[PDB]
Amino acid sequence: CKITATPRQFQPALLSTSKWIWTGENPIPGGSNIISTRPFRKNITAPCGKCSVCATIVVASDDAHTFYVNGVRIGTGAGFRQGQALFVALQPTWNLFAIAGQNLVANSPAGIMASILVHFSDGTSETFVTDESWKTLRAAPPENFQLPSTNDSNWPSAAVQGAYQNSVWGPPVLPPVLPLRGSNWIWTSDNVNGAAPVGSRAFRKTVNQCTKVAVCATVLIAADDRYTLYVNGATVGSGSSYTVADAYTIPNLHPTFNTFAINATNGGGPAGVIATILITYSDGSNETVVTDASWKAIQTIPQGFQPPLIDEFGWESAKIIGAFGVAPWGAGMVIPSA
Amino acid sequence: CKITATPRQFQPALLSTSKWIWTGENPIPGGSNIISTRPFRKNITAPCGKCSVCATIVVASDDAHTFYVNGVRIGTGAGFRQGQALFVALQPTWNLFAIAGQNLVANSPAGIMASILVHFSDGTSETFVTDESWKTLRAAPPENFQLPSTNDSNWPSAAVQGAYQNSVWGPPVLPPVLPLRGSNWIWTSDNVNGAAPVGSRAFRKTVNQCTKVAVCATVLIAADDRYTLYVNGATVGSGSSYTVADAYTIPNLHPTFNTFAINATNGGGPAGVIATILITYSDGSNETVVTDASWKAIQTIPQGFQPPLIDEFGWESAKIIGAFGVAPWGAGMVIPSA
């Protein structure tokens, strides 16, 4: 169904309403459990009138986990001290989450905790969490436990080992929404010897995976001194800090061809813009695009620098000022939580 | 270099200045030659200040030929009574055309004739023809005779068998620039029982071959009752005949993503638009797009129906009224010569 949602400020999945769950082989919530691998399933149905588009996921585990969405493996992680961020495109009405958790220390606690923030076509969103509504088994995961087509109608409920505020684990640290390590500060080639002239500069990067279906994009960005961000010609947002980064979700990507454009301005001295972009596809894979030398850049901004299709003849390759961590900006950027 | 050339009316390549050439084993022009296969090469260099983009080609032979451009085989044909159309993308400055011709009847004349109309980045055009400036050999085509890297500086000239007006062959008929045969008359789904309401309708078809580099597109189009054609949102032209088809060349295609849009109007009774589109890629292949059900269509034309990227949500599949040749329009369209 029709997608009304427009680019907006990124909205985090939070763990404070989720519960730790496990099988209940030991009925003491948070008691000791054996080394084992156990399966967990959760079905979700769109409310009448709207279609689910994509999801933001934070997951932590004692001890480890493997995360599937509609049968596609989307991540593996471990540890209860820090959560792990995942992004996945969804089907319009029915969606299946499946986690294979592992207890790797004998006679130790066990549990998985996840928060799934589901975004709908009209712009609203709903948080689903780990709780007793997840199915589980008191045995190792059968073949294809993660496929929607496996029948779990008779599986028992998962057993809650503890709420977010409990006496066993404590609040897991939320990861950054997206990493900047691996992205680069870029600018036009008039940035030389640590400084750049005063004024504005434009940057383009197009993503065109013609055999896949693009769905959602998450964007983390910062610039010295300020920026405005456009996707397919539409304004997403603006910022003016090179010490506090901004994050946006773009829920209306064109399905095959999308162009991100930046208009960054230098107020004086050093200049630079840095961004990490993650696009989710309908097949369950995703793509990370960073600011680097493949971005196109220009010093005199033509009118219509932000439309998707333009003649990129007079544009240069963006110059890399430095990988994230370079001076003066350093490694201390404040990054929104996933 | 920068492409200034804009959409324009298609310009036919003509044979009227080209000559029949062969090896000269028999020194009498147009005389008898033996059953054999013989090679022909021709180099072209772009004039100063402009870059060569693509070429339209008509070729005929006594008796048969295989046609290569920069080593890529692009067609095979035969016969001196009617010429054969080819379309190929070119490299900016140097290009090598090579033909392996065959005489298949003993003690019979032999000759190949070609006209190559090259279009430059600025919109100008120049015709290269088969003549004595082509290299040949008095032997079978060596291995890799068609590669640009093969050395022909010591090869002898080809021998002219006759001009366009000569006493052996006579003027070969020019083929249609493109076939309409195989394309379909399409319309919106309100066209039923041989008629459709009065009014305007919109149609879109996108070509996005993301691993190739698109260069030129040639378009053949007609409509009942009239149409206007757009490429990437830019106007190409308009026409108003279902008995006379129009041909355009588009020399400024975007290299990866191009959207064709038509706004057609029906004045009453039967309605339909039909088009064949040929796109050339830098690797020497081409792609033919025809009007069919994969075009998107809509009955109320939204503003911005012709921009490349739009939300194609409310658009239906185009309805096929019939393959070319169906009544009322019949098989008699007047089609520009290649």
Ligand SMILES: OC[C@H]1O[C@H](OC[C@H]2O[C@H](O)[C@H](O)[C@@H](O)[C@@H]2O)[C@H](O)[C@@H](O)[C@H]1O
């Ligand atoms: O380090 C990059 C930054 O350098 C210049 O601004 C630095 C400012 O840092 C502190 O805010 C300090 O209080 C100020 O006095 C100082 O100007 C430059 O103006 C910025 O555009 C940016 O390149």
Ligand SMILES: OC[C@H]1O[C@H](OC[C@H]2O[C@H](O)[C@H](O)[C@@H](O)[C@@H]2O)[C@H](O)[C@@H](O)[C@H]1O
């Ligand atoms: O066959 C399609 C054609 O049908 C209608 O054509 C009728 C008119 O055609 C000639 O213009 C003739 O001179 C007129 O006498 C005759 O009324 C329709 O009008 C056309 O738009 C077209 O659909």
Ligand SMILES: [Ca+2]
């Ligand atoms: Ca444990």
Ligand SMILES: [Ca+2]
């Ligand atoms: Ca600065």
Ligand SMILES: [Ca+2]
């Ligand atoms: Ca012959």
Ligand SMILES: [Ca+2]
């Ligand atoms: Ca009509």
